[PDB]
C-alpha cells in the first residue's frame, strides 16, 4: 500500500521513509508538499529537482541515511544508478541518479538489478546490505563498496570520509572508509592508485597534518623556507596574488581558507554540484582583485607538495595528469627559467 500519504506519514512520524503503515492528509501546491497539522498546512518538502514534486518527495524520503560515498566519487567511477536505494545529492538538492531500481514506481527501470535492462548500466551496490555482493558478481557493470574483504576480489581502499545525511565526515561512531570494486562489461577492473580530495569547506577548515598547521601558522616566507619550496611559486599558486586587477593563483582550498580568515571575499559557485575540481568566480572585497574562473582543489597540502615537486620544470607549458578521486585530473604547469610560474587544475 505505497502512496503519497503513506510517504508523508513516514516523514512526519519517523523522519524519513521507514516502511511503516499509516497516512496523513497532504496538499500539493507551488512545487511544495504540505501536510495538515491541527487545522493548518505545514511544509514537508520543497522540490528543487527537475522531477515532479510528488516523485521527488518520495525519492527524498527514501534516501540512504547511512554513510555513503560522496557523489563526486560515484560520478568519477561512472555510476549510473543505485541498487534498491536512493543516493541523495545534497549539493544539488536532488537525486544523484535519474532512475531507480526497486524504489519508486514512477522512476524504477527495474525492481531488481539482475533484470536485463540494468546490464548496460553501472549499478552501485552496497555490501553492507544482505545480498548485494552476490548481485555485484552477477552484474555486467557495477561499483561495489564494502566494509571488509570479499573473497578473491582485489580491493581499492577508498577515501577516509563519507557523506551522512549531507554531512561529510570521517566516522568515529560509524565506519566511513570502504573498499571499492568496479566491473566493466563483465570484467573486474583494477582501480588506479589515486590521491583523494579532503572535502573540507572554507570556514570550518581544519588542518590535517603538521605541514598544514605550519602553513596556517607561519608566515609565507617562513613556511617556504622550512619545506624547501623555493622556485615552485608556492605563494602565487596556493596563497594567491591580489595586487593586480586579475587575481593570480589561489588554487588550493587551504590557501583560500587562510585568506578568508584574514579578509573576506565572495565565491560564486556558478556550477553548483559536487566535483573533484571546483570552479569559482572570485572577488576579493579588500582589494577588488577578481577572477571569473578560479579553479580550486582541496588536496592535503603534503599531497600537493609531493605532486609539484615531482614535476620537470624545463618546459614553458605542459599538461600534467594526476589521478585524484579515481579520475584523471589535468593540471596546467607553466614554467620559466627552471622555476614554476603557475600550476592549476582544470575542470
Ligand X SMILES: N=C1CCCN1Cc1[nH]c(=O)[nH]c(=O)c1Cl
Can you say which residues are annotated as belonging to the binding site for uracil?
291-295, 342-346
Nearest C-alpha neighbor of 159 from the set 178, 182, 181? 178
The one of ligand X, a second copy, none whose footprint includes residue 295, by CB under 5 to 8 A per kind, is ligand X
The one of ligand X, a second copy, none whose footprint includes residue 166, by CB under 5 to 8 A per kind, is a second copy
Task: Determine the size of the site formed for a second copy (CB under 8 A).
Answer: 89
31's CB contacts (< 8 A; 6+ apart) are: 46, 47, 53
Instruction: Tell me if 317 contacts a second copy by CB under 8 A.
Output: no
Q: What is the DSSP string of 171-239?
A: -SSS----EEEEEETTEEE-PPP-B------STT----SHHHHHHHHS-HHHHHHHTT-TTS-HIIIII
Between 118 and 157, how does the x/- string for binding to a second copy read (CB under 8 A)? --x-------------------------------------
Of 132, 199, 279, 327, the one binding a second copy by CB under 8 A: 279
**Is 236 labeled as catalytic in the residue annotation?**
yes
What part of residues 172-211 is at the interface with a second copy (CB under 8 A)? 172-174, 176, 204
What part of residues 233-292 is at the interface with ligand X (CB under 6 A)? 251, 291
Instruction: Give the active site residue among 72, 182, 183, 251.
Output: 251
Of 147, 230, 268, 312, the one binding a second copy by CB under 8 A: 268
Helix (H, G, I), strand (E, B) or coil at 94: strand
CA 86 to mean position of chain CA atoms: 16
Round to whole Å and give the CA distance between 308 and 73: 23
**Is 251 labeled as catalytic in the residue annotation?**
yes
Instruction: Tell me if 346 contacts ligand X by CB under 6 A.
Output: yes
Do the Cβ atoms of 78 and 68 come closer than 8 Å?
A: no
The cell for 203 is 570556514
Residue 48 vs 339, nearer CB to a second copy = 48
Instruction: Tell me if 294 contacts ligand X by CB under 6 A.
Output: yes
Question: Min. distance of Cβ 128 from a second copy in angstroms?
Answer: 11
The one of a second copy, ligand X, none whose footprint includes residue 97, by CB under 5 to 8 A per kind, is a second copy
Helix (H, G, I), strand (E, B) or coil at 301: helix
**Is 175 labeled as catalytic in the residue annotation?**
no
Round to whole Å and give the CA distance between 30 and 22: 25
93's CB contacts (< 8 A; 6+ apart) are: 48, 49
Query: Per CB under 8 A, which region of 192-200, 216-224, 275-283, 312-320 contacts a second copy?
Result: 275-283
The cell for 176 is 566511513
- Give residues in contact with ligand X (CB under 6 A): 251, 291, 293-295, 344, 346
Catalytic residues: 236, 251, 291
Amino acid at each position: 500500500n505505497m502512496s503519497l500519504e503513506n510517504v508523508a506519514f513516514n516523514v512526519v512520524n519517523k523522519g524519513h521513509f521507514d516502511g511503516q503503515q499509516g497516512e496523513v492528509p497532504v496538499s500539493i501546491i507551488n512545487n511544495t508538499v504540505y501536510t495538515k497539522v491541527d487545522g493548518v498546512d505545514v511544509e514537508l518538502f520543497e522540490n528543487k529537482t527537475t522531477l515532479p514534486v510528488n516523485v521527488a518527495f518520495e525519492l527524498w524520503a527514501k534516501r540512504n541515511i547511512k554513510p555513503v560515498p560522496e557523489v563526486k566519487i560515484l560520478n568519477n567511477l561512472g555510476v549510473d544508478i543505485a541498487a534498491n536505494t536512493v543516493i541523495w545529492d545534497y549539493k544539488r538538492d536532488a537525486p544523484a541518479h535519474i532512475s531507480t531500481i526497486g524504489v519508486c514506481s514512477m522512476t524504477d527501470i527495474a525492481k531488481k538489478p539482475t533484470e536485463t535492462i540494468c546490464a548496460p548500466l553501472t549499478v552501485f551496490f552496497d555490501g553492507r546490505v544482505d545480498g548485494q555482493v552476490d548481485l555485484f558478481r552477477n552484474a555486467r557493470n557495477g561499483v561495489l563498496i564494502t566494509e571488509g574483504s570479499v573473497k578473491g576480489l582485489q580491493p581499492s581502499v577508498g577515501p577516509k570520509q563519507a557523506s551522512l545525511n549531507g554531512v561529510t565526515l570521517i566516522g568515529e561512531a560509524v565506519k566511513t572508509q570502504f573498499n571499492y570494486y568496479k566491473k566493466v562489461d563483465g570484467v573486474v577492473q583494477q582501480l588506479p592508485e589515486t590521491y583523494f580530495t579532503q572535502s573540507r569547506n572554507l570556514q570550518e577548515f581544519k588542518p590535517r597534518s603538521q605541514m598544514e598547521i605550519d602553513f596556517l601558522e607561519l608566515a609565507m616566507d617562513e613556511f617556504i623556507e622550512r619545506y624547501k619550496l623555493e622556485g615552485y611559486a608556492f605563494e602565487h599558486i596556493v596563497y594567491g596574488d591580489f595586487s593586480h586587477s586579475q587575481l593570480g593563483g589561489l588554487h588550493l582550498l587551504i590557501g583560500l581558507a587562510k585568506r578568508f580568515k584574514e579578509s573576506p571575499f565572495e565565491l560564486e559557485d556558478f556550477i553548483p554540484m559536487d566535483s573533484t575540481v571546483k570552479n569559482y568566480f572570485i572577488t576579493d572585497a579588500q582589494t577588488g582583485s577578481s577572477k571569473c574562473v578560479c579553479s580550486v582543489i582541496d588536496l592535503l597540502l603534503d599531497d600537493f607538495v609531493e605532486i609539484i615537486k615531482s614535476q620537470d620544470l624545463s618546459v614553458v607549458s605542459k599538461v600534467v595528469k594526476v589521478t585524484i578521486d579515481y579520475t584523471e585530473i589535468s593540471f596546467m604547469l607553466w614554467c620559466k627559467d627552471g622555476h614554476v610560474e603557475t600550476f592549476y587544475p582544470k575542470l
